[PDB]
């Protein structure tokens, strides 16, 4: 009835674009996170011992990138203002939206050419990628950036896309581990920011939550900036365990097993 | 129960032995929901090319068909079950590609220019999945020969390369080209449903694989012909969507809201 053969038999729906509204719900898929704030309050900073050369290489290269990025963004010294927080994450989530989508595509492409079951990996990686891009859609609202950032963002994609693509082919283990350790840093950053709100070292003006954040994370009009950070950090901690899991699975030759996290959205 | 205690765990490697293989988990939960006697009336459309690009897309699709019909010996012998399934195997390995690359490219845009996408990415992503679900379904009716596996692997290399540069140069062209591919998908499968009804093709695999049954939500008594019917409706959705998207590009509406987010 709603979507059926008369609509399926139409050449184009170009005529309808003017009369369809812009809703903030349609910006993501319907696979939204659903956290409970006083629970996720207790998300904590973890660190996973690296096994071999690959994990060490992933860890050192994450650590060398934090440092570079700390020092070129003048961030390490000055006061922790709301402007250097938004503006740092802003840049960081342009890059964070990439690894999920290269891995997903590539798993998709082998599923097709070897004609084999993927068993839940692709969509987990595809929603990681959207989730990070939803973080971007949200920070964008809190603070539009300048031309310098806009330029670095664009060149950075080219370097990162190209790197991650060859990395994923040569060694998905390395990329899942590399992400794993990125998310350790992302959780460190965000718990720091929530600590600073609490100790009064940062009082934010942007103490609304933009509509895109409000529907996506299902927050109430009364939600503080700190609440926004809290859900975001939870999201990041999820990705932390999921990719450390996926890297472990690779290390143990389980790249073709069932993705465990498909289950861990069930109430047993 | 997905809370701060599981979020605080290093790894779930230890659980992979005890998590069951479920046929529901092969896809997203964004599944099609057709009503069989409705979609029975899906029909065969053709969209006038607007300009040179649409024409060039149209000619590419038509030269591929000819090539692929002649080297697959489709004319030669009878319309068998073997030779239908075996051709759709090959075609869905290529059909899972365009939507993944288009979606990935729109994702990369949204990230680097920091702009709203307004619902395109996920439409194109599930198209890709949907076609890959067609493949997971047909793989069960018939594992292909070693020569077909080989030809599929070389094909993905050319097609993935081709679509990547084409989408970058001209997403209008790729959307139109897909648009016209799906016209053939609908021609083909209507033709198959016809043969079943006229008795020229008496199918053996009258047992819809479990992947297909739960993906499309069909009854246990559903027939191979029912399967073709939903599959052909899926293909028709994509026909109008990518012809829509191609038109949108032609009119410089690439950054408008994806009309099908409403028509959901
Ligand atoms: C391409 C430029 C290479 C410059 C060499 C410095 C590489 C990283 O530098 C090291 O990284 C750590 C990051 O956790 C810092 O905290 C250390 O203080 C620093 O020695
Ligand atoms: C790379 C090799 C290309 C060979 C070019 C010859 C094209 C074959 O002749 C053809 O006639 C068909 C009639 O059924 C038409 O449908 C096609 O448009 C056309 O390709
Ligand atoms: Fe992030
Ligand atoms: Fe992240
Ligand atoms: Fe198809
Ligand atoms: Fe198709
Ligand atoms: O992040
Ligand atoms: O097809």
Numbering used by the authors:
A (entry chain B): 31 to 298
B (entry chain A): 32 to 295
Reported in the publication:
The glucose-dependent respiration of bloodstream forms of the parasite Trypanosoma brucei depends on an unusual and essential mitochondrial electron-transport system, consisting of glycerol-3-phosphate dehydrogenase and the trypanosome alternative oxidase (TAO). Clarkson et al. first demonstrated that the respiratory pathway of the T. brucei bloodstream trypomastigotes is solely dependent on a “plant-like alternative oxidase” now known as the trypanosome alternative oxidase (TAO), which is located in the inner mitochondrial membrane of the parasite. The active site of TAO is mapped by the presence of di-iron and a hydroxo ion. The cavity has been described to be a ubiquinol substrate binding site and the oxygen trough.
